[PDB]
Design a protein around this ligand. Sequence first.
Ligand SMILES: OC[C@H]1O[C@@H](O[C@@H]2[C@@H](O)[C@@H](O)O[C@H](CO)[C@H]2O)[C@H](O)[C@@H](O)[C@H]1O
Ligand SMILES: [Ca+2]
Length: 228
Amino acid sequence: ASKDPTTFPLGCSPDITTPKKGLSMELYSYDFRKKGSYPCWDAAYLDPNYPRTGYKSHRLLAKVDGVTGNINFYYHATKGCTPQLGHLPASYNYPKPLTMTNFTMLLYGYFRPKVTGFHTFTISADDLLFVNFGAGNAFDCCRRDSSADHFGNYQAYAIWGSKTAKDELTVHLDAGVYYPIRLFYNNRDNDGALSFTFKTESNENTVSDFSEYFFSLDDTEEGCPGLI
Ligand SMILES: OC[C@H]1O[C@@H](O[C@@H]2[C@@H](O)[C@@H](O)O[C@H](CO)[C@H]2O)[C@H](O)[C@@H](O)[C@H]1O
Ligand SMILES: [Ca+2]
């Protein structure tokens, strides 16, 4: 598993144990700066090591399993520079309020395609969504705990305030293979939004519901490298 982003990512072949539905999620706090700061929001989220080590210094809010379905959301704040409560969609399996104006979220697991061929994932975010995809690039097959912090350059990323807060990733995938995926999200202030969808060459359907696509696999002693 090379770490570089590629159009032909490497996947994984789990053994006997049934993959579990959904991704894992970790939620962390992301404070504003002190009252009166200009701007009110902290730019820590754009430190190059924020998605790797920096987020870990912040308060851990939750770690949940089973995140699947439609993971898209749009949180409307009533004003900026203010921590405001909200809720993630039911898909996130987290039924507590959080400061939806200002938080960090990590999702990881595997993407299992239904078709063999080119997939184009489209992402957008307010404020930030960084995507790694493929063995090595995201993490190693059934060896996530050992490789989790060694993800490579992003396959796709979106940052609000850029020319477009939108990006795409086009990758050729094999049906029924399990591809490591890592989604890293932040809201710095005010509204928050995440959109993650895809299309394939097989038809003109847009997938927004990942119920049959996102899975979690236990790490194993020997890992589970792609056998196809
Ligand atoms: O529009 C979403 C965007 O809002 C940002 O807050 C903005 C701020 O950048 C500036 O334009 O002022 C307005 C109102 O005073 C405020 O909406 C926020 O920092 C971003 O993260 C986005 O949510
Ligand atoms: Ca925002």
